Amino acid sequence: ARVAIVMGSKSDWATMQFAAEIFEILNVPHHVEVVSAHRTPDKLFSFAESAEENGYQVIIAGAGGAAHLPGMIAAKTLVPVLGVPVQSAALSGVDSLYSIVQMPRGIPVGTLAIGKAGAANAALLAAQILATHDKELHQRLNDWRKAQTDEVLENPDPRGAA
Amino acid sequence: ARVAIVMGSKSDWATMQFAAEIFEILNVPHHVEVVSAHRTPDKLFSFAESAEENGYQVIIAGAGGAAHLPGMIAAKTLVPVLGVPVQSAALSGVDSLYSIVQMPRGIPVGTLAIGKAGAANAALLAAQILATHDKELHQRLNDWRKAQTDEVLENPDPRGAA
Amino acid sequence: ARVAIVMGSKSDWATMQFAAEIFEILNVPHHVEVVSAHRTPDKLFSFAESAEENGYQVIIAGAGGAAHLPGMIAAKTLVPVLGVPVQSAALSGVDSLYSIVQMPRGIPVGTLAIGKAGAANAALLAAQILATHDKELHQRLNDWRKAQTDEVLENPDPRGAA
Amino acid sequence: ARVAIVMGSKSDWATMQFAAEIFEILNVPHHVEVVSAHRTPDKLFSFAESAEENGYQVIIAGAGGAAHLPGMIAAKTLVPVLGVPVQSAALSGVDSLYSIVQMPRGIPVGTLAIGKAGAANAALLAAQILATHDKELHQRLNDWRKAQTDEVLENPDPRGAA
Amino acid sequence: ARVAIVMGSKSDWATMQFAAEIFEILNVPHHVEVVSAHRTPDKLFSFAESAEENGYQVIIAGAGGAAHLPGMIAAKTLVPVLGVPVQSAALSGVDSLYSIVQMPRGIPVGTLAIGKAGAANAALLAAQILATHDKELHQRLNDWRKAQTDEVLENPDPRGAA
Amino acid sequence: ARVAIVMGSKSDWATMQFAAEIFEILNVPHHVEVVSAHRTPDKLFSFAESAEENGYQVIIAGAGGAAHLPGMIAAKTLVPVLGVPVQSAALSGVDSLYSIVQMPRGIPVGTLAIGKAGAANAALLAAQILATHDKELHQRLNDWRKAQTDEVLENPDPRGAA
Amino acid sequence: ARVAIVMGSKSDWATMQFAAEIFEILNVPHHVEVVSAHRTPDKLFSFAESAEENGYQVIIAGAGGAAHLPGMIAAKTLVPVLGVPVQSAALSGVDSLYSIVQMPRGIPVGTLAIGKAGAANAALLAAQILATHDKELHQRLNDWRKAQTDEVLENPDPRGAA
Amino acid sequence: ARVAIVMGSKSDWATMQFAAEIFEILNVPHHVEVVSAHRTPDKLFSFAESAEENGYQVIIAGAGGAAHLPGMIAAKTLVPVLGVPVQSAALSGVDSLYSIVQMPRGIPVGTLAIGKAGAANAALLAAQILATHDKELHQRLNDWRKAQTDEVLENPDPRGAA
Numbered sequence A, B, C, D, E, F, G, H: 001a002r003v004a005i006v007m008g009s010k011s012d013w014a015t016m017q018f019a020a021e022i023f024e025i026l027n028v029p030h031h032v033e034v035v036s037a038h039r040t041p042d043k044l045f046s047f048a049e050s051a052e053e054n055g056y057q058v059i060i061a062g063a064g065g066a067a068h069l070p071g072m073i074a075a076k077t078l079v080p081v082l083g084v085p086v087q088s089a090a091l092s093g094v095d096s097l098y099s100i101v102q103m104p105r106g107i108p109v110g111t112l113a114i115g116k117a118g119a120a121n122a123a124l125l126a127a128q129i130l131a132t133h134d135k136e137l138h139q140r141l142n143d144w145r146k147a148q149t150d151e152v153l154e155n156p157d158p159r160g161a162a
Ligand SMILES: Nc1c([N+](=O)[O-])ncn1[C@@H]1O[C@H](COP(=O)(O)O)[C@@H](O)[C@H]1O
Pocket: A007, A008, A009, A010, A011, A012, A035, A036, A037, A038, A039, A062, A063, A064, A065, A066, A067, A068, A069, A086, B104, B105
């Protein structure tokens, strides 16, 4: 597996399952793990330190509220980190988004949309990255995009059949 | 020193100097250090792990933007952590505030106002905490508050002298 | 009891019960009372004035909307005040958060997350403060944190059993 | 004087001077005082308790950030309170506005615009209230409004003279 | 009737009924009418022009979204106008609040909280205004406030009976 | 003139001059006038009522803060109204934008960007509308757009000459 | 058909159906199509390029989140474009609104309210535009507006019958 | 060059120069071009269509306000796109951020911080991606990060020399 999907809590799985779905569709081997900067800080450090050796080329990290997980991983590895802001209850993911995207100069995290759209798109982006060097994966992405496009094109009128 | 003041960058000093000022006024010994979760992650872990042994009873941490520093310290010590959101340029500290205050259940950070007001108030709160067991410090806080109150009371009319 | 939990309305109890829960778990004696700056202003003043004599070393105060209760207590005692922003209907606690955290220089309130996460974390922070001088309580916090960490570590994969 | 203008700090005078200006224009006797819920809580209570006896029929209160002053006065008198949110630095008065307008059922504060527009309009509203029973003041307001209207009507084209 | 309650739509009644409730409780005669600046502009002008002659001393106006009704009434009468921001669906009354409170210098509207709290408080404020010259109404407000206070004081503990 | 540019205050001219500029460039005859819903309500009604007879086919209206002008014109004429939110000081035109765009069903206002970009674009949109039936104007818009495009295309590299 | 209604997804139809409703009421022939800048970019370009030839004089475009559809159409035709921000889940259409209204100088989109109110108002505005040159349509709009006004006027009291 | 830096306007260069700086530091060959979805739509399509053939493995795109450029490129190529929100005047890049990050499922853009921090971090992320397969570049990133870390570690005390 060349991609790891991690998240701050098991309660984030309802969101992050949409990243894993994309990888099943595109036949991308992936790791899935609950890793919390706040509740499991030492495992976070260990996970981030061993990511390259473990063969990860992209890491997708999701968290809600004061969403530190993606940034703290990015601080401890040169493996590209993609951040998914989970939709929090009070602030509807604005807290998650700001906590993730607003990284200082030197430690980037590529941030996707709040919520399930973002989880899916994080997997698609990870796939696009891997596809630069994986021609079979490149073809499969190409095919999947064409399928999305064609479905829309085949159904131009949203109204009831008549 | 029973209090440590730390911050994510030397550029935060313009703000965090107002915390140190309060400690000079109240004669509270304190440590001051640049500690970054993002740029110096290992030192953050070491600092947090050794805080109790080093004699710290309150930690004041300030950072801007994706402000992870206070929360990451709080994840690694039981010493109370107080967070100061530094006023960021684009988002005027809303990013800092959300990144600090919105901690998940289990790892608290007591958050103060955005900016220099918050830095001062973090020192005052740290002092109030210490004062529960330090009667001389308690008296000095009491005296300082009375001085603030009396100044306002002595100057009820904001208009020009006439 | 060395901690008081107060709130602006009985309707805040749905939130503030999560602070009291933490104290039951950690065996921390505590007081619970509805105290409103707006509806019971004189009792607020009396409560704040008598807090030290009554043996309180931390006060946790929660309120929604124009959330003045924590700050008004803090104006009238040197006992540390922790503020919990209750999640209001229209503004989802942004009004509560701003009303609490944005205190002027001289009168601090250590603010926690909007909602039930914040109520819990306020109790945990109060506990961390008390634990500086209460070794048995310190051990119990330590044990509780390890239990949270270990649960996450013991359940790394959020997916269905297979 | 049937109106009192109060504010949380002398630094608020730059804003609240625009309320006093309106009263000078309309020849309305008024009191001006720095009264802080946070720095002078006891004077706040005394001021609010004695407002009716002192002859006040409207109170205009201004404050910035965690702006508790108007609401705390309103909690302690039946004299109508009008609130002016001062434009704070970080949050540009959104904190002031929310802290003032979002009062719970039972204790109203009539809130005006953030900043100097609001200070002026608070005085005008206070004047409109008083004018219900003061025919000479009613005429003077009427005349002042006509003067504003006529100035605009007399200058329909904003372009340079030609 | 010395107070009129108006609103932009019949759909606002769910909110504005809480203003009328207060007047029933305090025995304040009042008028209730749907008046829209957008859908009935001419009636708005007629209503505002005839308000003084019709005996109104306070007008309470409520509207949602682009909430122009209160301000447009205030532009056309010297009778004090109080504005109630109705909680809109998308923006949860932030649009309503801004549209109402942010009036330019010369034309004030005293704004209350978003939603049903605001509707009630608008009636209470209108009552406080009228009470300056209506001693029987003043007593009734005083009694009602004491009843609210006493209820809270009589029920200090929010927990289940035991 | 088939287009009128109006604004709530002469202070809005700094912004609305960018609409007039576009009309000078495209040789579109236009009217310019300060018309305020708040300060000149009767003239607003008269202006809106006579717009069709006066030959206006688009009206561009700009205002800041509680920006009622565009919507109140739209309530009183079937001539299409385009709204320009002026950038207010405290809220940076969010108040202006919400006050303009959030119109209820039945009375539309086509809203453009906050500030000078919006003023220009309002004139361009008005021009596009008129161009549907004015072939010479259509050509001139076409030419102006090509000029903008070509300038960008002719300068692909933003770096210093070397 | 002189108006086209397009939208980024079939899921937007729940909103955009309220635009089509207005056209049915006013007997305005219209086209309806799902056109996505993101999922069908080439069809977007083709649609925009052929709009004038196809007889469209107004285009109404709706989309949610990162709502690029209206602006990308406007970049590729001189036919006036009206934008409808669909109410997104996390951000309640603030993302949609900003993505649509905040167009740079040169490429306007006339933006309506978030959600179903906006969809209706976009159709009404399109109709007002067309009505400048379509006297029968002008009469029908006039009649429809009078019907809305009269309904409100005929039902001034929102209370229960008695 | 395996990376292209593009932006909506020459006025964005003040921001995007910080991306190019990182590439100069790390000796990464790169292309720089003004490409606008709004002002040069056809060139955008051509650029995106030819990106893979032209040898680009990452594209960094920056734009302000209604920031469509990154997303429209991402719609037309499988080459990973990274988005930089430029800090707009009115909304301080919140419009830019929302327009970029909130992409629907299927078309991702990895978004970085508002402003110059984001531009730098976009280049660093692009570099991290390329470094997965470029060992010399990997070493250079590693060295650069160590240099940043060491500088902070070498300067722990922000206070004046004494
Ligand atoms: N932000 C965060 C981190 N962290 O940054 O490491 N760990 C958990 N959290 C968040 O707390 C939220 C609540 O988790 P829980 O209390 O429901 O387990 C989740 O969205 C999770 O991602």
